[PDB]
Design a protein around this ligand. Structure first.
Ligand code: G2I
Length: 314
């Protein structure tokens, strides 16, 4: 292989990226998107704020643009995300009880129906758990609906889309810890009772030099529950500006993550959360941090590029 797409294709695995469809008009961005990935996810275009800005009024143009991009380029389409506490519109926050449950169900149903037969997998529920174990403590869904909302969401998604792979997704669940144990318990429970659930997403927003050593073992125990696994939002952030040492450690870190996936038969692949450092979410959330992606802000390949190629087997 000479490209990351070629390495992943050759390995029989997915290598995806988070797309902002507005950046498609930047030709260098499009060139890399077209040639370097075999899967695409909408970074923002399929979230609740982006799809249902007022109650039962849907805006699918941006998500459709991502879907059409996937179909036109022959890439697998991954859906993100039906239920997530973050950036939920105020109209939804203002609802309670059965009115809120109904809005959630209607959102799942309408969005899943709209993209049916295009989106191959959904993050049905995103970030349900708390660092340190148990349920997230700042979620409208948890607060208004309690424990059962996850099962409700998965069943509604299956009702709408009989075949799509239905995933639950989270961060800080890459190692074996209280948070991933809570997640593991739910997955095992869902599979034991026949709640629709096919996959688990490991966001893998990691810090340079700190890839969990038990990542493979964790991915494997999940796969062994009878579900697929995926690295969904990989980036590996460092203190800026980058230097040779940090770039080398970052490359080694990318290799470790991709290798952990390669080493688990039901790991579908790895999706990186963007193309270029120019557009990464990291600097705005974490001041003084960044340079987390495979291409720098001028779209030059970083040492992480070779490391990803090598890990997929090339
Ligand atoms: O925060 C990183 C990721 C955590 N896992 C779930 C993902 O959904 C999440 O992605 C981020 O989700 C954020 C919230 O939806 C995104 O922030 C958005 O993107 C912008 C800057 O990146 C801002 O203009 C803006 O207010 C906001 O719409 C950001 O792009 C995007 O990368």
């Amino acid at each position: 292989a000479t490209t990351l797409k070629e390495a992943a294709d050759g390995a029989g695995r997915d290598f995806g990226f988070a797309l902002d469809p507005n950046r498609l008009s930047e030709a260098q961005y499009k060139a890399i998107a077209d040639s370097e990935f075999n899967l695409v996810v909408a970074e923002n275009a399929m979230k609740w704020d982006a799809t249902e800005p007022s109650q039962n009024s849907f805006s699918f143009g941006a998500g459709d643009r991502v879907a059409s991009y996937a179909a036109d380029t022959g890439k697998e389409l991954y859906g993100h995300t039906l239920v997530w506490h973050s950036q939920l519109p105020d109209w939804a926050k203002n609802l309670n009880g059965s009115a809120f449950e109904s809005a959630m169900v209607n959102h799942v149903t309408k969005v899943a129906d709209h993209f049916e037969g295009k989106v191959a997998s959904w993050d049905v529920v995103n970030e349900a758990f708390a660092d340190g174990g148990g349920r997230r403590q700042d979620s409208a869904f948890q607060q208004k609906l309690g424990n059962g909302y996850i099962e409700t969401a998965f069943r509604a998604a299956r009702a709408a889309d009989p075949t799509a792979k239905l995933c639950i997704n989270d961060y800080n669940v890459e190692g074996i810890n209280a948070k991933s144990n809570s997640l593991y318990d739910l997955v095992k429970d869902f599979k034991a009772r026949g709640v629709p659930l096919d996959c688990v997403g490991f966001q893998s927003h990691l810090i340079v030099g700190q890839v969990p050593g038990d990542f493979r073992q964790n991915l494997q125990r999940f796969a062994d529950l009878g579900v697929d696994v995926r690295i969904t939002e990989l980036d590996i952030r460092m203190r800026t500006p980058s230097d040779a040492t940090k770039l080398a450690t970052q490359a080694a870190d990318y290799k470790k993550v991709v290798q952990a996936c390669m080493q688990v038969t039901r790991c579908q692949g790895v999706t990186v959360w963007g193309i270029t450092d120019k557009y990464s979410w990291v600097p705005d959330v974490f001041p003084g941090e960044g340079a987390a992606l495979v291409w720098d802000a001028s779209y030059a390949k970083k040492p992480a590029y070779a490391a990803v190629m090598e890990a997929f087997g090339a």
